[PDB]
Amino acid sequence: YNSASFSTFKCYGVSPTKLNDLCFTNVYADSFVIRGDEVRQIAPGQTG
Amino acid sequence: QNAQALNTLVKQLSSNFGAISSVLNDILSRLDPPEAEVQIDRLINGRL
């Protein structure tokens, strides 16, 4: 969260500053590359 | 009849009413005020 040079740092249903205070069953990590204009399509309920 | 009324009133406390969760602590610990206020609004309406 503190690292700069990040175009987007957005969380759905979780406050980013609160993430250090929670426990989880498991965590998934998904990685890929897209264009600059296509970044908005990564969102719940988004269409593209 | 009195027992049934009290039991129904107690049981109605576990509903979500459209919020993410039915526990106030589970909402406060995950969100900032600007959205916890919406969730609390929904819960308040239902319980009223």
Side-chain angles (χ1 to χ4, degrees):
Chain A
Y1 154 80
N2 283 301
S3 184
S5 62
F6 281 83
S7 69
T8 305
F9 202 111
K10 158 204 294 324
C11 301
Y12 290 92
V14 176
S15 177
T17 54
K18 296 286 289 174
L19 278 155
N20 270 344
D21 305 338
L22 301 177
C23 296
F24 304 90
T25 302
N26 61 72
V27 181
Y28 290 92
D30 285 359
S31 173
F32 71 116
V33 158
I34 38 182
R35 279 178 279 195
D37 282 335
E38 303 162 349
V39 308
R40 61 98 186 160
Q41 290 177 53
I42 290 316
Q46 187 74 290
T47 303
Chain B
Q1 282 164 336
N2 283 338
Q4 281 185 336
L6 270 179
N7 287 340
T8 290
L9 179 63
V10 174
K11 189 64 177 179
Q12 280 303 105
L13 205 70
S14 292
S15 295
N16 287 339
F17 304 106
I20 59 174
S21 174
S22 66
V23 181
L24 288 174
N25 292 336
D26 291 340
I27 301 168
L28 296 169
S29 75
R30 287 200 292 160
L31 294 183
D32 286 343
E35 318 84 332
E37 84 92 39
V38 180
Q39 313 298 315
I40 286 167
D41 280 345
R42 289 181 191 174
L43 295 181
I44 278 176
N45 290 338
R47 295 171 177 177
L48 282 182

